[PDB]
Each structure stands twice: as C-alpha cells, then as structure tokens.
Amino acid sequence: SEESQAFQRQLTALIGYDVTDVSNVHDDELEFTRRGLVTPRMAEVASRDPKLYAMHPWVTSKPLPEYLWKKIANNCIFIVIHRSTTSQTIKVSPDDTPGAILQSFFTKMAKDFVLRVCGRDEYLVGETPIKNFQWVRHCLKNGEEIHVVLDTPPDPALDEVRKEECDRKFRVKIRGIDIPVLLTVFVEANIQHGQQVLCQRRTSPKPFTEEVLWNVWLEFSIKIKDLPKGALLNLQIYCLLYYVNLLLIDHRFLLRRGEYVLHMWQISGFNADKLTSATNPDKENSMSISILLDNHPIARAEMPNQLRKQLEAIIATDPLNPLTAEDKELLWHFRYESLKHPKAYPKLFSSVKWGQQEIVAKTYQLLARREVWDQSALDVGLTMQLLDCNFSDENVRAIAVQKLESLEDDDVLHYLLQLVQAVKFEPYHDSALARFLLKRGLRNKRIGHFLFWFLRSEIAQSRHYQQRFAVILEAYLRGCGTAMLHDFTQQVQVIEMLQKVTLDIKSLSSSQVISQLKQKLENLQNSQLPESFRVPYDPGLKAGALAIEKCKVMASKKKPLWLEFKCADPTALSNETIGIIFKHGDDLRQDMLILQILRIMESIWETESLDLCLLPYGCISTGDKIGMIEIVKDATTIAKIQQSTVGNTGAFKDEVLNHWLKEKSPTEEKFQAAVERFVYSCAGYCVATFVLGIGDRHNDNIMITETGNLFHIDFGHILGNYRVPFVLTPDFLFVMGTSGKKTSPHFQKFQDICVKAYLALRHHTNLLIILFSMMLMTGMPQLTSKEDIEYIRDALTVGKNEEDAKKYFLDQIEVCRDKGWTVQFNWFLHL
Ligand SMILES: CC(=O)Nc1cn2cc(/C=C3\SC(=O)NC3=O)ccc2n1
Numbered sequence: 001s002e003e004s005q006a007f008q009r010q011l012t013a014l015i016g017y018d019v020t021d022v023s024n025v026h027d028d029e030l031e032f033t034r035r036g037l038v039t040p041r042m043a044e045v046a047s048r049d050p051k052l053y054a055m056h057p058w059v060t061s062k063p064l065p066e067y068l069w070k071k072i073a074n075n076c077i078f079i080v081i082h083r084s085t086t087s088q089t090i091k092v093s094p095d096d097t098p099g100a101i102l103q104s105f106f107t108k109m110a111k112d113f114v115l116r117v118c119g120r121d122e123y124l125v126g127e128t129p130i131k132n133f134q135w136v137r138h139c140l141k142n143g144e145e146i147h148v149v150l151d152t153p154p155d156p157a158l159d160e161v162r163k164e165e166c167d168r169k170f171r172v173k174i175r176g177i178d179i180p181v182l183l184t185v186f187v188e189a190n191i192q193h194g195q196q197v198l199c200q201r202r203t204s205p206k207p208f209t210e211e212v213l214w215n216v217w218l219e220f221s222i223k224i225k226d227l228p229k230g231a232l233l234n235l236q237i238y239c240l241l242y243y244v245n246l247l248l249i250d251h252r253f254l255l256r257r258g259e260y261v262l263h264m265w266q267i268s269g270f271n272a273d274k275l276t277s278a279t280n281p282d283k284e285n286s287m288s289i290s291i292l293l294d295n296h297p298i299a300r301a302e303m304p305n306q307l308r309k310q311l312e313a314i315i316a317t318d319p320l321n322p323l324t325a326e327d328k329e330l331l332w333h334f335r336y337e338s339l340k341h342p343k344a345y346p347k348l349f350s351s352v353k354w355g356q357q358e359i360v361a362k363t364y365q366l367l368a369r370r371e372v373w374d375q376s377a378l379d380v381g382l383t384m385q386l387l388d389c390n391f392s393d394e395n396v397r398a399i400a401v402q403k404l405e406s407l408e409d410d411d412v413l414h415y416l417l418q419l420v421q422a423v424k425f426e427p428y429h430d431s432a433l434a435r436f437l438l439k440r441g442l443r444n445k446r447i448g449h450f451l452f453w454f455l456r457s458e459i460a461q462s463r464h465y466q467q468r469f470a471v472i473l474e475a476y477l478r479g480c481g482t483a484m485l486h487d488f489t490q491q492v493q494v495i496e497m498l499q500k501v502t503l504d505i506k507s508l509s510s511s512q513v514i515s516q517l518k519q520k521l522e523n524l525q526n527s528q529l530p531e532s533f534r535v536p537y538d539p540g541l542k543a544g545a546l547a548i549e550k551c552k553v554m555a556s557k558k559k560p561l562w563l564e565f566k567c568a569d570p571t572a573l574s575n576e577t578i579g580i581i582f583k584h585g586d587d588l589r590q591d592m593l594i595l596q597i598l599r600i601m602e603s604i605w606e607t608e609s610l611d612l613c614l615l616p617y618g619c620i621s622t623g624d625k626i627g628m629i630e631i632v633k634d635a636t637t638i639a640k641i642q643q644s645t646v647g648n649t650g651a652f653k654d655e656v657l658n659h660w661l662k663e664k665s666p667t668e669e670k671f672q673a674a675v676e677r678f679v680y681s682c683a684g685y686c687v688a689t690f691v692l693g694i695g696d697r698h699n700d701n702i703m704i705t706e707t708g709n710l711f712h713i714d715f716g717h718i719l720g721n722y723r724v725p726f727v728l729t730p731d732f733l734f735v736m737g738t739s740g741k742k743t744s745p746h747f748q749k750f751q752d753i754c755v756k757a758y759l760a761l762r763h764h765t766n767l768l769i770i771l772f773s774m775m776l777m778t779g780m781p782q783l784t785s786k787e788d789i790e791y792i793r794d795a796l797t798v799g800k801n802e803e804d805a806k807k808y809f810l811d812q813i814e815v816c817r818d819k820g821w822t823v824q825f826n827w828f829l830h831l
Pocket residue numbers: 556558560581583617629630631632633634635636713714715
C-alpha cells in the first residue's frame with residue numbers, strides 16, 4: 001500500500017535507520033527476524049489491559065524501607081487533592097488503595113475519576129497500597145507533600161495500534177583480500193563458540209599490497225558433525241588490523257554455502273564489537289575478504305566426601321577465578337551433583353566441550369532435568385552471568401531468560417540498560433532475550449520509553465549493532481500505539497534541532513557567543529520547535545517553550561549548552577523551569593552505565609535499610625559523542641566554592657565549604673540537616689566511586705546542593721582518558737568537625753556509614769562483578785584486558801572476612817587524610 005509506505009517512512013525517521021535497506025546483507029536473517037518478531041509483538045498487544053496500559057502506574061512489591069517508615073507519624077500519610085483553584089488535604093493509611101482514598105474523598109466532601117500527580121503524567125491507580133507507589137516513596141524520601149489532581153483517565157483509544165500487514169572435516173577457501181589504498185600480512189581463521197577457540201588455521205604470510213591472493217583451502221580439525229549452533233567463523237588480518245565474523249550455522253539451521261565477499265572492521269590503531277556478525281557498511285574504503293565454502297540440517301553414582309568438598313570449593317569461588325583443566329573435568333564428571341547447585345551453572349557450562357556433538361547432546365539431556373534451577377530463587381547476578389560473552393548456546397541462554405520472566409517492572413527498569421547491552425552477546429538477531437525486552441516494553445509505557453532511547457542511542461552510533469537494534473526497535477514501534485508514536489516524533493524532532501545548535505555553537509567560540517546562541521534559539525522558537533515534548537530522561541515531565549533569557553553556553557572546553565524550558569503542564573505547583581544540558585565531545589554512553597550502577601547500589605543499600613543520598617541524575621546519549629544531561633537545581637561545583645576565595649590560584653582553604661553551607665541554610669535547623677546529608681552523601685560517593693575505580697577526581701567534577709547533597713559528575717570525561725582512592729579532602733573533613741589527625745562525632749558517623757555500606761556491597765559481590773565486566777565490554781572499549789575487569793574483585797576484597805574488609809576501607813580513609821590537598825593541587829597543575 002501507499003499509506004503503508006508512508007507509515008514505514010515515519011518509522012524510519014524515528015529509528016534513525018532504514019530496516020528495509022538490503023544492501024549491507026549476505027542473507028535474509030534481518031528480514032526473517034522482522035517477520036519472526038510479529039508473533040511475540042501481537043501476543044503481547046493482545047494481552048494488555050487498555051486502562052492499565054494507558055495509565056502506566058509506577059509501583060513496587062518491595063517493603064517500605066525502615067528510613068521511610070520513620071517519616072510516617074501515626075500510621076498517617078497526607079494527600080492534597082486539587083480540583084480547581086482550591087484543594088483539600090486528606091489523612092490516609094499506608095495500606096489504603098487509591099480506590100479507597102477516592103471513596104474517602106467523596107465522603108469527607110459531600111455537604112469515573114482518577115488521581116493524577118500535579119504537573120506530571122503519573123497516575124496513582126490500581127489495586128496497590130499508596131505506600132507502594134514510587135511517587136509516594138519519592139515524596140516520603142525527599143520531604144515533599146503528595147499533591148494530586150482529580151481528573152479524567154486518558155482515553156485508551158489514543159493507544160490504537162495500526163492494523164498489521166557428515167564425518168568430513170570442515171574447510172574454508174581464502175581467495176584473497178582487497179583494500180583500495182595503503183609490511184607482511186596473513187589471514188587467521190578461527191572457529192569460535194562462547195569466546196573460546198574450538199579450532200584455528202592460518203594462511204602463509206605475503207607482502208601487504210592493495211590486493212593479496214592465496215586461493216588456499218584451510219582445513220580444520222573439527223568435523224562438520226561437531227560444529228555447534230552459534231559457532232562463528234572469525235576471520236582476522238594480522239601484520240591485528242582487521243576482523244569480520246560469519247555464522248557457520250544460519251538462522252534456519254543450515255550450514256553456510258558458497259561465495260562470500262565480506263567488508264571487514266578495522267581495529268582502532270575483550271570488546272563486544274569484536275563479536276558482531278554485521279559487515280562494515282562502508283564498501284568504498286574498507287578492507288574486504290573473499291572466501292568460498294563448500295562441504296545441511298542439524299544432528300546414579302555417589303560423590304565421595306573429599307571430591308564433594310573440592311567441587312563445593314570450586315562452586316564457592318568468584319566469577320573471575322579461572323577454571324583449571326582438573327576443575328572443568330570434576331564439574332563435568334559429577335555434572336548431576338553440580339546441577340543441584342544453581343550457583344555452579346556458569347562454571348558447569350564453561351566445562352562443556354561445545355565442539356563435541358555427543359557432549360552437547362549430554363548437556364541437552366542434563367538440562368531436561370531442570371527442577372532445581374526452576375524452583376530456585378531468582379538471582380539476577382547468576383542469571384546475568386549466563387547472558388555474557390562466555391555462553392553462545394541457545395538453550396543455556398534461554399534458561400537465564402526464563403528466570404528473568406519473574407522480575408517485576410520496577411526491577412526490569414533497574415536492569416534494562418544492561419539487558420539491552422547484553423543483546424550484543426547474542427549469536428542470532430532473534431533471541432529469547434530480544435523477545436523478552438520487546439514484551440516488557442510493550443507491556444509497560446515507562447519500560448517502552450526507556451527501551452526506545454536505549455535502542456536509539458546504539459542505532460545512532462554503532463555500525464556493529466545498528467542493524468540488529470533497528471529491527472528490535474521497529475518491532476516495538478509497531479505495537480506501542482499511536483499516542484506513543486506521536487510522543488517519540490516530537491522528542492526526536494526537538495533533540496535533532498538542539499543537537500544542531502550544540503554543534504553550531506561548538507564551531508564558534510564571550511558576549512558574542514551568548515548573543516549568537518540567543519539568535520539561533522529565537523529562530524528555532526519561530527518555525528521549527530514543536531509546542532511541547534516529553535523529557536527523555538524523565539518522561540512524566542513535559543517541557544514547553546524555551547526560556548531564552550536563561551539559556552547560556554557553559555564555561556568549559558566542551559562548551560555545552562545550558563537550556564531552560566517552561567513546564568507545559570498547567571497543574572504544576574511551581575513556575576520552576578526544566579533545565580537540560582546539551583553536550584558534544586564526551587561519550588555519554590559511559591555516563592549512562594555508571595549512573596545505572598549507582599542506582600543498583602542504592603537498591604542494595606535499601607535492602608539493608610541504608611539511605612546513602614546518591615544523586616544519579618538523568619543522562620541520555622543521543623548520538624556520536626553527543627547527548628543530554630539533567631540539571632540538578634541549587635547545585636555548585638566544589639572548585640567554584642573554593643574559587644570564590646581564593647581563586648583561580650590553587651589556594652585551597654579548609655573552612656570554605658562549611659561557610660558556604662551555613663550561608664545557604666535559612667535557619668540553623670536546616671543547616672544541621674544539610675551537615676547530616678553531607679555526611680551520608682560523602683559516604684555514599686566515597687564507597688561507590690572506590691568500588692568502580694573512579695574515585696580520584698578533580699574538584700571541578702564534584703558538586704553539592706545547597707541542601708548538603710554531594711554528587712560526582714562527568715563520568716565519560718575520566719573513563720574516556722583512563723594517587724588517591726577517593727576524594728575526602730580537608731574541606732569535607734571540616735564540615736564533619738574534624739581537622740588534621742583528630743576525630744569527631746560526625747567523622748565517626750562517616751566511618752561507621754562507610755563500613756556498613758561497603759560491607760552491604762560485598763554481600764552482592766558476584767552481581768557487581770558481572771555488571772562491571774559487562775559495562776567495560778559493551779561501553780568502554782580500551783578498558784578491557786582482564787586486568788581492567790579484575791579491579792572490582794580487588795576493590796571488593798574477595799577472600800577477606802568482614803573485620804579485614806572493615807580495616808581495609810578504614811585504611812583507605814586514612815590514605816586520603818595523609819594526602820590532604822596534595823592530589824587536588826596536582827590536578828590543578830595538570831591544567
Ligand atoms: C545548578 C547547576 O549547575 N546544576 C547542575 C550542573 N550539573 C552538571 C552535570 C554534569 C555535567 S556538566 C559537563 O560538562 N559534564 C557533565 O557531565 C550534572 C548535573 C548538574 N546539575
């Protein structure tokens with residue numbers, strides 16, 4: 001159809017990639033995947049509750065934290081209900097449902113409707129106690145009043161979805177290599193499964209010219225019979241300069257046949273990019289390799305005491321502890337005992353000889369008896385280990401996804417970014433993981449909003465994964481509904497225009513620069529910029545017109561744009577603007593990953609009734625070295641506080657921060673609350689930052705709210721171009737009533753909090769190791785090694801008892817006290 005063609009054009013603009021373009025493909029896998037994803041999409045669409053989908057309530061099944069219960073008076077929660085120019089306060093029980101609150105309202109005021117958060121598209125609806133709404137917990141945590149408006153539920157009609165419409169050994173011939181413009185060169189051909197090399201062959205070395213020919217059959221030791229599903233033929237050019245991969249068994253279970261001309265990826269003169277089955281779209285300047293294939297469908301005891309102790313010891317070790325040949329042999333030999341231990345699963349499946357058909361068969365038999373795994377309690381860390389680069393088997397990965405099905409929405413949000421990144425480790429485009437993400441996104445608008453942005457971030461800048469991610473995004477967009485499609489259209493339009501202004505102002509650069517920014521912004525406000533758009537990092541908020549007067553260029557070497565918008569919602573309780581920073585020059589995909597780990601650390605701390613007052617601000621990567629950042633209100637740089645007496649001259653003073661805090665507090669009650677908040681937030685960042693190895697920062701990259709909340713910024717800056725374990729300078733110590741080498745009640749509180757927080761993190765060692773490992777593999781190329789990944793295991797002091805771990809961290813605090821201002825001074829000189 002022609003309007004079908006118009007609909008596809010609309011999707012193409014939202015995706016930032018054309019899924020119907022068949023020029024960078026040597027098979028129909030992506031087209032097969034598009035068709036394959038129709039069923040799961042349609043099944044999820046057919047399953048959803050129109051009213052609940054439209055209202056997307058944001059809820060949790062987790063207990064109300066101890067620190068939140070203490071904020072509730074006499075089992076009473078106050079809710080202010082608005083109707084027009086007047087409002088009405090109502091007392092409520094924490095166990096009260098919004099339905100019961102609504103009937104409580106009509107009763108109190110007598111002599112079809114829905115509760116919506118004032119100024120936000122957030123609804124307090126469904127069969128859930130109010131204490132279980134995320135917004136209520138947000139308000140309870142931050143000392144804010146819960147303000148609601150009584151309004152009409154959104155019409156589910158707005159979410160309408162458009163009507164859909166061999167015993168021979170394996171061998172490969174290396175014909176030659178070609179590159180248009182330019183040593184000795186050879187080609188290495190590996191058969192890989194789960195990052196491990198099953199077999200390797202190489203060509204003879206030849207002079208490196210624009211065309212190099214071999215016409216050689218490379219015969220492997222592996223029989224065609226033994227090639228596992230998901231095995232890659234990895235082809236590399238050494239002088240490592242270039243690489244490319246080819247799936248040996250295709251998406252239809254057929255062995256690859258015939259002629260291939262593969263455009264290779266160049267190494268920037270391990271990482272997830274090195275695993276891609278995509279070929280380089282640049283046919284003009286890339287190196288190509290020409291190959292030929294020619295060769296089909298797919299083919300009780302009792303452990304003794306000591307051996308059991310040995311096996312149990314292997315299972316107890318961390319995910320990074322290497323398995324010896326003996327360890328693997330024990331795991332495999334006593335696999336029926338290993339199966340009784342869910343924690344053994346990653347080690348056991350690493351003991352599988354994936355290049356032996358009979359062994360893979362024995363593994364499939366083993367997993368048919370999955371009673372222990374199925375009955376076991378969901379362990380996200382354990383599940384995530386089975387979805388990394390180490391596992392290429394469909395069945396193994398699928399049992400990990402099976403376990404994820406039990407996660408509630410709030411938990412899917414906590415792990416969404418890293419589950420999207422895990423799609424990079426999947427051998428085929430259509431996978432259980434990709435289907436899982438599609439379903440959870442279509443089931444919940446909040447998950448779907450973030451899935452859009454996370455996918456779009458990779459489609460905009462990854463040539464390695466854009467094709468796979470674009471087919472997943474199209475599948476989601478074909479089921480989200482028209483209201484969501486309209487919303488995304490507006491967001492994309494705004495961000496594309498603001499990205500233009502960001503780069504334009506970047507080319508220039510003063511009073512001249514600010515004048516030019518304001519002229520470019522009026523021009524946008526004139527005939528391009530739509531009336532409003534949902535804030536990508538906070539979709540409950542809608543931004544309206546630019547407040548031109550408040551817009552400026554930041555005084556940094558990356559001269560980012562500081563933009564302010566009016567809120568588009570009339571029901572908002574304040575005339576406070578929405579502040580957004582637009583920056584070019586840093587890879588914000590790295591900031592996204594750090595900020596998500598910080599949120600995970602906060603959830604861990606919550607499990608142990610600890611609130612460390614972190615501030616993981618909104619951040620979204622929109623394209624190559626470009627994106628948006630949430631401006632935290634009433635915040636200033638530690639360096640700026642130092643600068644405002646004395647300079648500009650590295651002359652750091654101890655009392656300045658405490659002075660600033662006192663100046664910003666309207667009363668002494670508020671000042672004491674600010675000092676308490678500083679102690680907790682300083683503790684939170686010292687612990688978090690140390691564990692992630694990002695602790696040693698210049699003061700210019702640490703901020704504080706007038707309310708005493710410390711927080712680190714600019715994570716991509718350090719991770720892009722990567723002594724003291726963390727920042728605990730004499731100014732921070734003075735706020736805590738400490739100087740030099742003495743102690744105080746606040747500093748003792750700080751040390752106690754640090755230890756508790758550090759020990760709480762250590763209870764989730766394996767989860768933090770997997771998350772850290774995946775972050776480096778998918779987000780920070782050039783920070784791989786195994787040595788880099790091992791940092792977190794040293795920081796988390798694995799193999800130490802709690803008392804030794806406590807001493808270790810207290811010693812780290814002392815290192816900071818010994819160094820004083822020395823490190824900050826060297827950061828200042830390194831100008
Ligand atoms: C009031 C105020 O200044 N708030 C504020 C500033 N701010 C900055 C960031 C992060 C940045 S700025 C830069 O160049 N790079 C970054 O990563 C985050 C929050 C925030 N709030």
